[PDB]
Write a protein that binds this ligand. Structure first.
Ligand SMILES: OC[C@H]1O[C@H](O[C@H]2[C@H](O)[C@@H](O)[C@@H](O[C@H]3[C@H](O)[C@@H](O)[C@@H](O[C@H]4[C@H](O)[C@@H](O)[C@@H](O[C@H]5[C@H](O)[C@@H](O)[C@@H](O)O[C@@H]5CO)O[C@@H]4CO)O[C@@H]3CO)O[C@@H]2CO)[C@H](O)[C@@H](O)[C@@H]1O
Ligand SMILES: OC[C@H]1O[C@H](O[C@H]2[C@H](O)[C@@H](O)[C@@H](O[C@H]3[C@H](O)[C@@H](O)[C@@H](O)O[C@@H]3CO)O[C@@H]2CO)[C@H](O)[C@@H](O)[C@@H]1O
Ligand SMILES: OC[C@H]1O[C@H](O[C@H]2[C@H](O)[C@@H](O)[C@@H](O)O[C@@H]2CO)[C@H](O)[C@@H](O)[C@@H]1O
Length: 1526
């Protein structure tokens, strides 16, 4: 059915962590195959790799993976297969990895670097767990019960073993771990294997004899089997070691140990003559040890030649100097240090005259000097005659060379004898280890460091035996050359075993690899898995190769390993590459009760009430996605991995901590009788069994054996004594876990609470799906530490039920047999008296323990949380799609967004945003305000967050989500969305308090995702199929477009009205701004597909035309403000954008609006019946604007006075606009004016700037004239097409100018008036006064401005003209001008409003400055430095266009030999948007800010989400889409 996981990648190709589970591994969940399907019928899993669109990896990117393409192809570690990444600047690419067999798989990505070179990422691994079934019933991995049994103690016959099998089958174990069933070595230790290729001749004779026994265990007792596999060593007496001695490290293969060999055999030879030469051979005196130690120092250390292994043979070099004194002589280097600089000169000879392998160990005299290169230096330094003091000089240098070697030797020898005498004392003088037997050949003074034999090749050899350094790093091969442990005697050896020298591969030890391969696949044919002792000491490449050979034989190979590497990260890396399925954890390692509770806490599960993962505002919502319309397209027999909700965003693949196999007692740790007591066997095994993981135990733990069995010496047999000790309880524990294994699946599905009080440990196991749980009270018996009484146990919203209770008591000591291992007689008394009180009001269960509850007892309760059934998850994960069926792009605004001021508008100031105690209010009143806070809470499982606390303290926030929508109930689809929230929140309130936060976030997140998907479906295809970033920008369109009560766009009605920004531009007269609306109209409405809403705004403002101008401040169409020389031309540009994009958009031209205010610019007539009066068409409105500007205007502001602008000066109200017909440019404004977008008016009385505009842009503005040229080009081609008529324009006098002539006037005179030529020679060609110019290569920001220094100021406004009227610019001039803006005026997120190299540059906006600075106080800086985000949109839109015309590297051909941008240009475009993608990702408001201080510094006064900040970035994506993506 659906076994697909989503693995989103970052921009560098690294997997993305969906949740913080800790240091882990990309493990895929263990699940059975579909009903009646084998390996190969279908892929076991499919990993969907998601690559971000436009990321640097997509540039000629390829996905590599060693996953075979089909089931027929075998797995190869190093054969990777190609997968093509489909590059796009809008759409992310998904590449499936079909997996057919469990194993270790990895993937890496290759791409084209920014250096045009090839680059590769890391290898990223992910494990598919094996499928474990017994007959035809699936065994979940966390329900495995493993019984470890030692072969040589189960009996001499196979039937003697099958009696043990029946005992562990009654205890209901489902897996048996075997110590290696091979022929054992001399010492008969199970791990020193004599021959790897044949089993124990005492019991078996062939593979079929042991294969039938394991298959018998499967069919008879329903038990799987696995063995230990020994890679690190073999027995010291293998008949194949005589044939192939190179399989270990010897004097040939590892020459560095030659020094250690001659020391081991010396020590043993001294042991033979210990009392002969000296006498102390077996005493308990520390002085007696000192005598033999001094004997060692004089009988071995002194007889070992002062160790020439380090030091250079001084006199033997001088002897050889005279010999070749006269051959390759003379040097030339003048750097040769002076003879006075002894140390410096000493090491100079070391670097130049040495034979290969200097300083390192080898043979006796392996470190020597190159003579012809040494004597050549002496001739150059001293004299060419030898007897001239060379013997003194040469010896002096060599003696100083050996100074570090001698100190290296003293430090080595000291750690030899310290290690020796310390070990000698312990091994002899019983401190904690006795057996101080008079030394013998079997018990020599020194433990055997090397195994000696005479090989079949004739020569003698000395293979050592591995072991372990005390506290050394196990990742270091102590037998390799990097370690000096065998020399310094820092090795605790195992004489039973012998080295196994693997190299870099089969080339270094051919027979060893071939033999171990056939040895591995032999056990792989029989058993279900392997167990690896000291896996951390086996090299990675060694473990990787043989485990893959096994999985080729047994595809469902279950791997266990005792893995204690340096850290958790190294543990995860070993699990990643080796494919380990479970890690061994030992419960006996806990020294105290607190250490045991912390161990059980690690492997118990997640906290109770843990948050559940949901796709939120960080996911793409493709409009063309499959959906579970009612979460019903799941069949249990399919065994499919479920999606999170009705939306089919597949289950995310995230790193989870590697699985654990919790052993209450292994075959190497001491018995509870030894470390603690025998009574602790019951509570210790119960706490382990309650963990949500695999569990196991050694044989004898349940049968309370007295002490740990010596794996080397002991020969006694397991007792046939049935049903002893805990065998009855383990039958209960394993049978209980079988009932739980049927439904518990993933890591979020099993939760836990653990408490430790004194000697008691509390374990509360909980299933998060149904509410079923277990409660365990276990009194531990580490020591008999007196009576302790546990306080009252209290469970909230839960009912308890007594299951079972037991006590373990000791009835004397264990029998002392010599032929059979028998345990300690123990009584297992069932307990009673547990009072379970239930308060039928508070629904609180109280549990009191009985006073007869001795140490070593347990009690199990069955529990069930109230309000949770099996049908709760389906009710929450369904119905939300059907509830959003009637939602519209306007109505989604009330469900998701609404600022508190926008909510006060509908609630008359009563409601607002929910106040979270000790935190604050969410940014939006809708779900977006919750999702912005919950995403980090769900990611970290922060149950201590103030919102998490408030959600379980009461149902206030739960009812707040549903009660808000009463304000917007009558709107499209909101009522049905409220009813879904009402029905789901009501069911949630019936749950326990501690479970409310996790379920509250799940309900909000599900409805949020359904609302965001509904938005992408209602929008166009370019948006509804793009990356998260584009969709996040498109959701801003919903934030701004909403119906209000205190304002609108029509004076008669109350309809949708695009706000300028939230929250400071949303209510009353501050919401709609004509300039702001029509800059964002193309981005927020046309790019998204809101065609009818874009028409309503064009028609609404068309009613308020006056002076031939469009008003900036729109008071819903009643008394608007006409101080906007900018708005009319952004408005006429939005009409062109509408007609160009909307199909049949020419129909807008003949739409008749009822023009309020008379044509003759009369007076404010809101009541006067001459308001409605006459109608005007849009075609007429356009011509009215063009002709009125041409014919000249003249007006003082209507209702002029402070009443409007309480700071504007009297002359400031009479603004005007006139067209210089010599040039064609439209001039207008004054030094008391703000008629452009930089409209900051002074309000400082201290700095005396009241009335003084910060940025008056009087004269010819670039944007106005650029939009004028765009409008003229629009109406010319329109009259040609017949949709426009008017072709004549008037004059202030009364003449007439053709529209084409006005169009040509700008074409002939625009660039002349504005471009500042780089050539100082062409200032006589572009109307420039060189006295006032900051930089050249700049299109002037103004023409004929009042203060002419503002004419030549570098401001970002010229980009508007470059985008809307590119014909006004010669390509080479514009390309260089916009490259300067990129280097100078471009900030990280916003565009700098003024060149930093100006004296007026003040880039920090503080609208509360009450200082004396004329330019900074009260926010006069507004447009003199601060970085605005919308100007970045117009900038990069033209930066893309003119780089496509100029730089040829930004061009590429292909389809239809049509020029599409190169990946080099897409790379430059993608880079300039990372800060914008970061901003909208990590902002509580789900948009882009209005303003930013210098260099990305957050401006507090800036509105955090602005309409035209995100709309202009949507303009860029539509340019690249509508022109290339066809
Ligand atoms: O009856 C309705 C209305 O009538 C009159 O309206 C006039 C205003 O009182 C008058 O000030 C003026 O409005 C100007 C404004 O003066 C001018 O500076 C500019 O607006 C700027 C601010 O200058 C600027 O600092 C910034 O202010 C933001 C701030 O950055 C933001 O962080 C947050 O604090 O919100 C502040 C705004 O509230 O940005 C704004 C916008 O760019 O332009 C305005 C419009 O021209 O002229 C109005 C003419 O009607 C009455 O005076 C008024 O009381 C009445 O309510
Ligand atoms: O309608 C929901 C309501 O939620 C918020 O108010 C609640 C607090 O979040 C909640 O912790 C609790 O506060 C108590 C405090 O003693 C104190 O706040 C007092 O004024 O009210 C409670 C008295 O026990 O309960 C309140 C609601 O009573 C949020 O702030 C409200 O705006 C919101 O309406
Ligand atoms: O040489 C160019 C000149 O540019 C700037 O001078 C500005 C000045 O800051 C304005 O206040 C006004 O005087 O217009 C001038 C136009 O260049 C630099 O400040 C100045 O150092 C530089 O020399």
């Amino acid at each position: 059915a659906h076994r697909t996981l989503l693995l989103r990648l970052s921009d560098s190709g690294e997997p993305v962590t969906s949740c913080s589970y800790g240091q882990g591994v990309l493990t895929l969940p263990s699940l059975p195959l579909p009903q009646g399907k084998k390996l190969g019928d279908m892929p076991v899993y499919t990993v969907k790799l998601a690559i971000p669109a436009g990321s640097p990896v997509t540039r000629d990117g390829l996905i590599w993976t060693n996953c075979p393409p089909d089931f027929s192809t075998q797995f190869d570690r190093e054969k990777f297969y190609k997968k093509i990444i489909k590059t796009s600047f809008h759409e992310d690419d998904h590449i499936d990895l079909d997996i057919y067999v469990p194993g270790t798989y990895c993937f890496y990505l290759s791409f084209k670097n920014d250096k045009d070179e090839l680059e590769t990422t890391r290898k990223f691994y992910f494990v598919v767990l094996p499928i474990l079934s017994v007959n035809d019933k699936f065994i979940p991995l966390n329900s495995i019960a493993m019984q470890s049994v030692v072969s040589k103690w189960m009996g001499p016959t196979i039937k003697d073993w099958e009696k043990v099998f029946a005992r562990v089958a009654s205890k209901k174990y489902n897996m048996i771990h075997f110590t290696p069933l091979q022929h054992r070595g001399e010492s008969n230790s199970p791990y020193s294997i004599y021959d790897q290729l044949e089993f124990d001749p005492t019991v078996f004779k062939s593979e079929k004899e042991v294969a039938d026994m394991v298959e018998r265990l499967r069919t008879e007792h329903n038990i799987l089997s696995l063995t230990d596999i020994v890679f690190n060593h073999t027995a010291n007496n293998s008949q194949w070691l005589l044939d192939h001695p190179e399989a270990g490290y010897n004097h040939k293969t590892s020459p560095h140990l030659i020094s250690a060999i001659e020391l081991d055999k010396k020590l043993l030879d001294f042991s033979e003559q210990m009392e002969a030469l000296g006498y102390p051979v077996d005493l308990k005196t520390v002085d007696d040890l000192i005598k033999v130690m001094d004997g060692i120092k004089e009988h071995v250390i002194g007889e070992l030649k002062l160790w020439e292994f380090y030091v250079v043979d001084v006199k033997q070099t001088v002897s050889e100097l005279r010999e070749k004194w006269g051959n390759s002589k003379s040097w030339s280097d003048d750097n040769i240090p002076s003879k006075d600089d002894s140390t410096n000169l000493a090491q100079f000879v070391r670097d130049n005259a040495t034979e290969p392998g200097f300083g390192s160990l080898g043979e006796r005299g392996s470190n020597k000097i190159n003579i012809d290169k040494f004597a050549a230096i002496l001739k150059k330094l001293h004299s060419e005659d030898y007897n001239n003091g060379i013997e003194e000089l040469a010896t002096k240098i060599l003696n100083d060379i050996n100074l570090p070697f001698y100190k290296e030797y003293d430090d080595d020898i000291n750690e030899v004898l310290e290690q020796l005498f310390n070990r000698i004392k312990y091994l002899r003088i019983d401190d904690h280890g006795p057996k101080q037997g008079p030394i013998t050949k079997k018990l020599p003074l020194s433990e055997p460091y090397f195994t000696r034999f005479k090989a079949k090749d004739g020569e003698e050899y000395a293979l050592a035996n591995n072991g372990a350094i005390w506290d050394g790093n196990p990742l270091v091969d102590f037998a390799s050359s990097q370690s000096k442990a065998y020399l310094r005697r820092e090795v605790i050896v195992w004489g039973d075993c012998v080295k196994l020298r693997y190299g870099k591969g089969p080339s270094d030890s051919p027979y060893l690899w071939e033999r171990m391969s056939k040895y591995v696949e032999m056990n792989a044919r029989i058993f279900n898995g392997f167990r690896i002792d000291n896996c951390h000491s086996t090299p990675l490449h060694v473990g990787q190769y043989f485990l893959d050979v096994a999985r080729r034989v047994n595809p469902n190979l279950y791997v266990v390993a005792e893995l204690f590497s340096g850290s958790e990260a190294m543990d995860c890396l070993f699990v990643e590459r080796l494919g380990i399925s479970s890690l061994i954890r030992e419960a006996m390692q806990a020294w105290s009760e607190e250490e045991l509770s912390r161990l059980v806490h690690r492997h118990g599960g997640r906290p109770i009430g843990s948050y559940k993962f949901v796709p939120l505002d960080d996911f793409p919502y493709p409009a063309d996605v499959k959906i579970d319309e009612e979460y019903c397209a799941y069949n249990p027999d399919d065994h499919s991995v479920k999606c999170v909700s009705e939306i089919m965003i597949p289950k995310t693949l995230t790193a989870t901590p590697p699985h654990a196999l919790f052993m209450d007692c292994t075959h190497d740790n001491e018995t509870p009788n030894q470390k603690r007591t025998v009574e602790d066997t019951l509570p210790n095994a119960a706490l382990v069994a309650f963990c949500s993981s695999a569990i196991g135990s050694v044989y004898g733990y349940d049968e309370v054996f007295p002490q740990l069995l010596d794996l080397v010496q002991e020969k006694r047999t397991y007792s046939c004594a049935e049903n002893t000790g805990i065998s009855k309880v383990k039958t209960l524990l394993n049978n209980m876990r079988e009932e739980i294994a049927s439904e518990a699946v993933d890591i979020e599905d099993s939760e836990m609470h653990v408490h430790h009080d004194g000697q008691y440990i509390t374990f509360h196991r909980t299933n998060a799906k149904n509410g079923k749980g277990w409660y365990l009270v276990a009194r531990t018996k580490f020591h008999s530490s007196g009576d302790q009484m546990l306080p009252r146990i209290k469970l909230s919203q839960t009912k308890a039920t007594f299951k079972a209770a037991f006590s373990l008591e000791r009835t004397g000591d264990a029998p002392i047999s010599d032929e059979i291992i028998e345990g300690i007689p123990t009584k297992l008394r069932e307990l009673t008296g547990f009072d379970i009180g239930f308060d039928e009001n508070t629904k609180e269960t109280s549990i009191l323990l009985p006073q007869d509850f001795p140490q070593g007892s347990i009690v199990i309760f069955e529990t069930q949380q109230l309000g949770i059934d099996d049908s709760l998850d389906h009710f929450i994960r369904s119905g939300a799609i059907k509830a959003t069926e009637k939602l519209s792009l306007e109505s989604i605004n009330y469900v998701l967004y609404r600022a508190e001021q926008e909510e006060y508008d509908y609630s008359e100031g009563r409601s607002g945003a929910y106040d979270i105690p000790d935190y604050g209010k969410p940014v939006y009143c809708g779900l977006q305000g919750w999702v912005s806070i919950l995403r980090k809470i769900i990611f970290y499982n922060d149950l201590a967050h103030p919102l998490s606390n408030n959600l379980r303290n009461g149902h206030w926030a739960v009812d707040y989500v549903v009660n808000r929508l009463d304000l917007y109930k009558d709107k499209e689809g909101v009522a049905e969305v409220q009813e879904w929230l009402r029905s789901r929140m009501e069911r949630i309130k019936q749950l326990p308090s501690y479970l409310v936060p996790s379920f509250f976030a799940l309900v909000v997140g599900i409805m949020y995702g359904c609302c965001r998907l509904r938005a992408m479906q209602l929008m166009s295809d370019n948006v509804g199929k793009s990356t998260v970033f584009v969709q996040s920008l498109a959701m801003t369109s919903i934030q701004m477009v909403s119906a209000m009560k205190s304002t609108s766009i029509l004076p008669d009605q109350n309809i949708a009205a695009m706000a300028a920004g939230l929250p400071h531009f949303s209510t009353n007269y501050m919401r709609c701004w004509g300039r702001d609306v029509f800059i964002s109209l193309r981005g927020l409405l046309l790019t998204t597909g809101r065609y009818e809403e874009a028409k309503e705004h064009i028609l609404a403002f068309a009613k308020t035309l006056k002076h031939g101008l469009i008003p900036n401040l729109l008071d819903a169409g009643r008394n608007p403000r006409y101080n906007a020389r900018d708005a009319a031309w952004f408005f006429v540009q939005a009409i062109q954008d509408y007609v160009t994009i909307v199909p049949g958009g020419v129909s807008l031209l003949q739409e008749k609006v009822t023009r309020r205010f008379p044509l003759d610019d009369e007076y404010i007539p809101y009541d006067d019946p001459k308001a409605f009066s006459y109608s005007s068409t849009i075609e007429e409105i356009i011509y009215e604007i063009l002709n009125r500007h041409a014919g000249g205007i003249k007006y003082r502001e209507a209702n002029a006075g402070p009443n409007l602008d309480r700071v504007m000066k009297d002359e400031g109200f009479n603004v005007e606009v006139n067209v210089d017909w010599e040039t064609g440019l439209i001039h207008g404004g004054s030094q008391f004016n703000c008629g452009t977008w930089m409209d900051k008016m002074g309000e400082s009385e201290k700095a005396n700037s009241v009335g003084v505009p910060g940025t008056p842009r009087d004269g010819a503005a670039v944007e106005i004239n650029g939009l004028l040229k765009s409008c003229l080009r629009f109406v010319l081609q329109l009259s040609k097409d017949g949709k426009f008529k008017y072709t004549e324009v008037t004059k202030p006098d009364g003449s007439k100018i053709s529209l084409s002539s006005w169009n040509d006037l700008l074409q002939e005179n625009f660039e002349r008036c504005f471009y500042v030529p780089k050539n100082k020679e062409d200032d006589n060609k572009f109307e420039i006064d060189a006295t006032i110019i900051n930089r050249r290569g700049i299109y002037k920001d103004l023409y004929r401005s009042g203060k002419p220094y503002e004419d030549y100021q570098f401001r970002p406004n010229f980009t508007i003209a470059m985008v809307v009227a590119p014909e006004l610019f010669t390509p080479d001039y514009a390309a260089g001008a916009i490259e300067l803006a990129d280097q100078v005026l471009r900030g990280p997120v916003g565009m700098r409003t003024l060149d930093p190299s100006d004296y007026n540059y003040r880039p920090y906006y503080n609208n509360g400055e009450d200082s004396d600075d004329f330019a900074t106080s009260k926010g006069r800086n507004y447009h003199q430095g601060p970085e605005w985000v919308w100007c970045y949109g117009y900038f990069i839109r033209a930066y893309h266009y003119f780089n496509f015309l100029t730089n040829p590297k930004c061009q590429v051909e292909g389809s239809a030999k049509k020029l599409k941008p190169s990946s080099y240009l897409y790379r430059k475009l993608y880079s300039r948007l990372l800060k914008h993608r970061e901003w909208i990702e990590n902002s509580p408001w789900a948009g882009l800010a209005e303003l930013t201080n210098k260099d990305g510094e957050v401006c507090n006064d800036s509105s955090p989400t602005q309409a035209w900040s995100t709309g202009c970035l949507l303009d860029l994506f539509y340019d690249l889409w509508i022109s290339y993506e066809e």
